[PDB]
Amino acid sequence: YDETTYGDQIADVYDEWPGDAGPPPDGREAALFVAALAAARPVLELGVGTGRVAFPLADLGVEVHGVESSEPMLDKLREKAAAHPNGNLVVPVLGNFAKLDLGEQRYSVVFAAFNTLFCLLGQDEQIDCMRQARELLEPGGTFVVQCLNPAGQRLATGNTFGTVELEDTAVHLEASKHDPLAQTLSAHHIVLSEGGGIRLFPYRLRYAYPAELDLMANVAGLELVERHADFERRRFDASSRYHVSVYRAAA
Amino acid sequence: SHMRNYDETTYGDQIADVYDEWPGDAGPPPDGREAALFVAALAAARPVLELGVGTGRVAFPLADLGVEVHGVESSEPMLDKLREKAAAHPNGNLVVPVLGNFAKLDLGEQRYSVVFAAFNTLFCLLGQDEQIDCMRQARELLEPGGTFVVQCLNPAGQRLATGNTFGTVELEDTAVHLEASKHDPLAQTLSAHHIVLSEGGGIRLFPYRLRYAYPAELDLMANVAGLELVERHADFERRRFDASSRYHVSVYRAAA
Amino acid sequence: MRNYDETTYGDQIADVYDEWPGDAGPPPDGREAALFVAALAAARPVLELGVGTGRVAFPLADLGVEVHGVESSEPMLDKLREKAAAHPNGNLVVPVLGNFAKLDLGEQRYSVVFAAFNTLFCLLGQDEQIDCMRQARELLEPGGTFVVQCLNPAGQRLATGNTFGTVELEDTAVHLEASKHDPLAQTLSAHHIVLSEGGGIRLFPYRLRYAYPAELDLMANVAGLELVERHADFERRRFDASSRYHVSVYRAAA
Amino acid sequence: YDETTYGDQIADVYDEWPGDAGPPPDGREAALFVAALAAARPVLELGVGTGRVAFPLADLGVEVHGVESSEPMLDKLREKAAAHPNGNLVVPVLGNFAKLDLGEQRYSVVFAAFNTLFCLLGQDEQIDCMRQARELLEPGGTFVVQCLNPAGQRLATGNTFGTVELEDTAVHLEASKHDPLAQTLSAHHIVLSEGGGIRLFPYRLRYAYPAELDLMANVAGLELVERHADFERRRFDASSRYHVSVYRAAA
Amino acid sequence: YDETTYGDQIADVYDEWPGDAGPPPDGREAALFVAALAAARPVLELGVGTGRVAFPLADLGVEVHGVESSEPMLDKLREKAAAHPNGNLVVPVLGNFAKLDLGEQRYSVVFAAFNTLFCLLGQDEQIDCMRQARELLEPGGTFVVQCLNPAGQRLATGNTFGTVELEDTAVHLEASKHDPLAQTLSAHHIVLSEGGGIRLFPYRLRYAYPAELDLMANVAGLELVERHADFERRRFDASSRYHVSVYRAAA
Amino acid sequence: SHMRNYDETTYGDQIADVYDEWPGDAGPPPDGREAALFVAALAAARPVLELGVGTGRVAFPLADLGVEVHGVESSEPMLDKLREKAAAHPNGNLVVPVLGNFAKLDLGEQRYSVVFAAFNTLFCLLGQDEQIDCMRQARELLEPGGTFVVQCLNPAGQRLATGNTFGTVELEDTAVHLEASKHDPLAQTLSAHHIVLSEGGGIRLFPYRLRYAYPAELDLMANVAGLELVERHADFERRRFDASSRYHVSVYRAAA
Ligand SMILES: Nc1ncnc2c1ncn2[C@@H]1O[C@H](CSCC[C@H](N)C(=O)O)[C@@H](O)[C@H]1O
Ligand SMILES: Nc1ncnc2c1ncn2[C@@H]1O[C@H](CSCC[C@H](N)C(=O)O)[C@@H](O)[C@H]1O
Ligand SMILES: Nc1ncnc2c1ncn2[C@@H]1O[C@H](CSCC[C@H](N)C(=O)O)[C@@H](O)[C@H]1O
Ligand SMILES: Nc1ncnc2c1ncn2[C@@H]1O[C@H](CSCC[C@H](N)C(=O)O)[C@@H](O)[C@H]1O
Ligand SMILES: Nc1ncnc2c1ncn2[C@@H]1O[C@H](CSCC[C@H](N)C(=O)O)[C@@H](O)[C@H]1O
Ligand SMILES: Nc1ncnc2c1ncn2[C@@H]1O[C@H](CSCC[C@H](N)C(=O)O)[C@@H](O)[C@H]1O
16 A cells, blocks of 8 residues: 555546545635635645645636645646646646655645545654645745544444445445554445446545644644634534644744 | 436336345335235225335235225336236236326326325335325325325334445345445435345445435324324234334324 | 355355455464363364364464364365365374264264364354254363353344444455344354455355353253353453453363 | 423523533524514514523513513513613513413514423424414514424433533433434433432423424414524534524415 | 342332333233133242232232242232232242242242342352242143343443433432343432432342243253243244243153 | 532542542552552662552552652642551551642652553643643653653543443442543543432532543653653553553653
């Protein structure tokens, strides 16, 4: 399992998957939230993917630099950009965001949507990444992450099998193993289709509790300034499935 | 829920050629004989209407008891199964198959001593509004004495998880029957795929959707349709109905 | 699940039994089991009930312990003979085609008779398990002991009715299990399912009849056995209610 | 168990109980919600109680007629009114709201906060009540109810026992029985104090599910106009513990 | 904890407790079941208590000998008998039914209702008791037990606290410890009253699973002849909270 | 929430005179001896510091091993119990009681070969910030060799319900120990009353509050405090720590 194998497998279907099987449908709202903080300056998406968020941002006239480790994901992105009327505002960068190498450039916002931070499989690595994000922010800037909230996510300890989504001729199931000590989720997204085809798309995450994530930020030189349930600024509480957290350079 | 092509027809269409072959808990419940006795006891020894007759799991047991049964069914393939069976049945001449949608019954002058809907058939109509319409049309088809009987999953005793679930339905030597399902406790809908995995590598999916009603609500729907509840059991063998009953069988008659 | 022998477990799983990764495979306690058994073996031969592919037999042979292995499954037995020919100590493993519900070993006696990894529970009834225990007892020498490793229902927290679970993940397949539990007949009846990236599906069915400790102990008494020690595993960790398994040692009764 | 025994017991502590033991802290918000619908005409609260909502409404210059069955609850109300700078705007009525008897008077809003409609132990009785509320609405009028939402309320079937709230020198527990058929909750709120004292305060509800409630409203001649999670108009979904529903006369 | 302390405490309330707090309301049906098996000969109730079943049997003209360890329970029995028109047919015996001592006398039925046999805290003791019951049966005789069925009882592993019953001015709660190895239930029935009154009634049970109980009977010289869910001969299955089992002397 | 009179002190004050008398699961864990052996092994020839020494359930077994112990305690009544026991104990002179709040230790020049907090004592400090401060101070009191040892509930294996719960802790012939608690999974706080109901009609309430930390988080706290983790067990007998371990015992030393 690489930094890359998530992207590699899923690239060509990431955008086609229906409902709960796909990524969350908050592209537009995410773009507004980031854009609302971005002003006229450029922003850095970590793990830009197929640009689910980047393109909505470019529609708002926001320059976005997308770091991505996956060749195949990156190709999807560049394909979509060439067809997008605003593609020129999306700047794809091949690279590993655990070890960003962006030189002089600085950003008004650095964000990681939909568990991207949790794609780095260790607390250390996540602290490194945050510290790096910090160092790329300009005076005003902020760091925005969207993360599963373990409490509200009600994660069975051990192994689990669940129904993700139904289509007319396929089902989307997920088989997974949870290690509540390492705090890791390791899983297969399974697609079963009529007449018997089976496709498996594996992923691993390391998650953090909020109190922990906030201390991680603190070590990174970040301090938390707001926390919501989603990009529409809904109230965050214990039963929130996700959180959106905004951080800024610390005193 | 993102099963964007679901008809009043696609349940039947898919399942017709295996509906009768599925073992144990995978197949329909094994109370055909009982349900026929139950309905028959209620026939003014006269013709009854099965809503969603299917392959005739109930209709043929009724024909064996000398009861005339009109079966309304929306699925071309189920109806083909039913007709193919009737030709071979020694009493098939007592089963009258009707192609049609029972949300919009059109049977003219004919009246019935019993209109029934077994095994969640009524909940196949995906709406409270539609269900009421159907009950009222049932009511209007009953003769003086007549009654309307429904067999329905009882939400309480069915202990339905909120949200999505995945479950083992039945095991065979060379295949498993699983169910993948989505429950919307507000819309009160169950939306699901019955999955059959086989030693080949083969996979067949058979989707279904239900809108369920709670007994208090269902009784109020019957009241709106001009029916009043006359009895309620756990099964067609008249076992006592209580909170932990998985299903109920309810009998309604025209209102005062 | 209508067509289940004493054979169909083995027949199906033999060529993959040894290949399945992590939790999908048999427990990785072969060496420890051998040690545990060897310590009670002395200088005499031991009888493994349902020797299978020799997951425990070969570790025993490595310790210089002679092992007679009873197995009903042609295919399992063939795996065993194949590994024995290749093993440096294969000669110390004695395979025996037979059904251990009806052992027929004549004059031979054993310093230990053991059934690992729920093998005793493969006999689908309380009656058959008693019979087998009685037979094992009658095959022990003076000193001998009878050793079983068994799932502990309490610690195993079995749901009532049907369940479906993820057993293990591989890069290109998943191992699932579909099961039915009958808490009254105390039976577990299941399919181990392997889905692979091809679209291939392989099903491997099994059936167990479990027994609660208090009940198994009574069964042993009726068979002329009395319990001497109980652990959680072959490393002699303390047995308690949340132990997923137990290892019980019985000897002939006074 | 009368229409009366809920109030009779709880009156003298209803307002003193802390946190989750007391009634919800949305009196102000309720008042605002009702007031916005009130226009220039008087409104009718069903089971006004101690005036937790009535008085906030009076602060907004809205005339409130309060119907209540419990002598002791009513006494608490009148006591608070005399002290309240706007007490004269609250009009207490002894009576059973299952059998309202208000003659010619008409209201711009009839409301029932905090499960009050659910105090009537039968679907029949609830329908009568709604029909009667309908007939007391002027032309524009609306009927507002706040009700537990069974889905979001995740009610165990059968008996349960639970912690309600903690004080320095008491605990608030709750012993209850759920009949999922009759859809009734029958309970004792229990206060154990450090003295060795025990007080019990029993209550009964019959709840309805939203789709059922709506159909009841229809039979009463009402139609649903809006539904929220609370009086601040948050969105109502499956996991909403309560709902607030606004109904108006039907076409 | 004695073989006695169950009875001693509960005697004066055993018959007064409402609903689910009381003993099951199947006394009449029990008597009918036992009478049908009784033939012309006398029957022996183990742990007769306050004669919840013995008196209904007397009403059927059946002679009942009742063994009881609890002085106070026995006193309740004798008090009811004197008042009962058929009390003369109930023969109380002070004694411990783990160690019956009835000499020459033989019975057409020996029975233990409502977990009575589970009152002996050990597999050994229970076998002994069965073997003695066997040895007291005449030729035709049968041994009858009513027992909690652990499967259908869905017993939490570990401690629990539940609501047993509700009264207008008291609640019945139960605090409990389950040892799934020893197969023991150890508990306090708790009554809290509006006074400030707390009463604790402790009990212990050792249960057996059916397969195990049947093996026990085999060791005692009994073989199982029929099993129901209750004395009305409803069908026993996994979800049956109790079972009624009828044994007879073995071949 | 509404226990608005909760000090560093009100746990101790209330429980002191029954802390040692409570049976089975209601009392503190019976691992005093084992803790003492574990700590003494790390202790070397310098004094050890117990945080929240309480009634000396661990201190006295240590003094039995000839180890000098300084016990910080905030509770007047607990300390009174401790002093009472020491006077009667053959080795009490080795136990040195200190009135103080270990969130704000003030021990001057003295240094320790071990500083430990047993049975969730560190979690008595109701905040992540306070717990770090306390770890940093412990760090600063350790000599060169020194280690800092904590015994803490492991939330994963503790399987804490989210929200409020009510449970049976222990049973006596004439009293039950129940527990009523509220769990805030965001604040990571447990707040509760231990309730004793007795045959008299008597009610005793003993309230407590914890802030727990997950191990990964606790380690990062230790890192911020200048500590690095050197070993982790499930208990003082060094059994293996895993997901289903109810507690953990963690040893930290000064960082490179
Ligand atoms: N270490 C790493 N460096 C760079 N990209 C990474 C990475 N680990 C994961 N990724 C990429 O980050 C993405 C996580 S998926 C999220 C895609 C996109 N942000 C969206 O919300 O739709 C994938 O495209 C994956 O290939
Ligand atoms: N709107 C509609 N009109 C007519 N038939 C319908 C319908 N919706 C579903 N059905 C049919 O109703 C049946 C439900 S299955 C029940 C079949 C039969 N009553 C039995 O118990 O065996 C299916 O045959 C399905 O095709
Ligand atoms: N009645 C019976 N007689 C003989 N062997 C049996 C049997 N029932 C099951 N078996 C065999 O017992 C084995 C159970 S698998 C256990 C194998 C081996 N002891 C190990 O631990 O790895 C299988 O080989 C199965 O084929
Ligand atoms: N049938 C009936 N008629 C009139 N009032 C009733 C009633 N049944 C219950 N009540 C009263 O309705 C109130 C429910 S409590 C709600 C009080 C107030 N609405 C608040 O939100 O704070 C109690 O005061 C109770 O005594
Ligand atoms: N070892 C023993 N010997 C005799 N009686 C016992 C006993 N252990 C318990 N008992 C008594 O048996 C009774 C169990 S309660 C059941 C009472 C009665 N059979 C009924 O159904 O209502 C109590 O009266 C208890 O005191
Ligand atoms: N902030 C603080 N400062 C000092 N002592 C404290 C404290 N908070 C809690 N305590 C004390 O720490 C103890 C927690 S209970 C543990 C007691 C002892 N270590 C044992 O193992 O048995 C109580 O005695 C409590 O009064």
